[PDB]
């Protein structure tokens, strides 16, 4: 289910094909280690939550989208709905994702 963005024009379409179901983005680096080290946690949800949408952005080949959210520390989790930001929390905290999803579920 998870999907990696590509550019700005894309980041838009994704939010347009995700209907309105929870849309949680994972702004982190794919090249870095400790960043993609939290993958078996955010990426393993593609099976558990089959109704929620999950996206992944690389702050290296898509800095255009990262610099758009004005991030300040990776990894940075963002919440989008209908194409509007409703939640956003950064930190290497993965156990927070779950509960957080229960927030906009």
Swiss-Prot record:
PROSITE patterns: THIOREDOXIN_1 (PS00194), THIOREDOXIN_2 (PS51352). The modification N6-succinyllysine is found at residues 8, 94. GO terms for molecular function: protein homodimerization activity; protein-disulfide reductase [NAD(P)H] activity; protein-disulfide reductase activity; RNA binding; thioredoxin-disulfide reductase (NADPH) activity. The keyword Lipoprotein does not apply. CDD domains: TRX_family. The active site is at residues 32, 35. This is Thioredoxin. In the fully reduced protein, both Cys-69 and Cys-73 are nitrosylated in response to nitric oxide (NO). When two disulfide bonds are present in the protein, only Cys-73 is nitrosylated. Cys-73 can serve as donor for nitrosylation of target proteins. The keyword Cytoplasm applies. Participates in various redox reactions through the reversible oxidation of its active center dithiol to a disulfide and catalyzes dithiol-disulfide exchange reactions. Plays a role in the reversible S-nitrosylation of cysteine residues in target proteins, and thereby contributes to the response to intracellular nitric oxide. Nitrosylates the active site Cys of CASP3 in response to nitric oxide (NO), and thereby inhibits caspase-3 activity. Induction: Up-regulated by ionizing radiation.
């Amino acid at each position: 289910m998870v999907k990696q963005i590509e550019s700005k024009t894309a980041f838009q379409e994704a939010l347009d094909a995700a209907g309105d179901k929870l849309v949680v983005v994972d702004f982190s680096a794919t090249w870095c280690g400790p960043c993609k080290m939290i993958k078996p946690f955010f990426h393993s949800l593609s099976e558990k939550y089959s109704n929620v949408i999950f996206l992944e952005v690389d702050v290296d080949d898509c800095q255009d989208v990262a610099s758009e959210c004005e991030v300040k520390c990776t990894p940075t989790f963002q919440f989008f709905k209908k194409g509007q930001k409703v939640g956003e929390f950064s930190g290497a905290n993965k156990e927070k994702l779950e509960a957080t999803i229960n927030e906009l579920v």
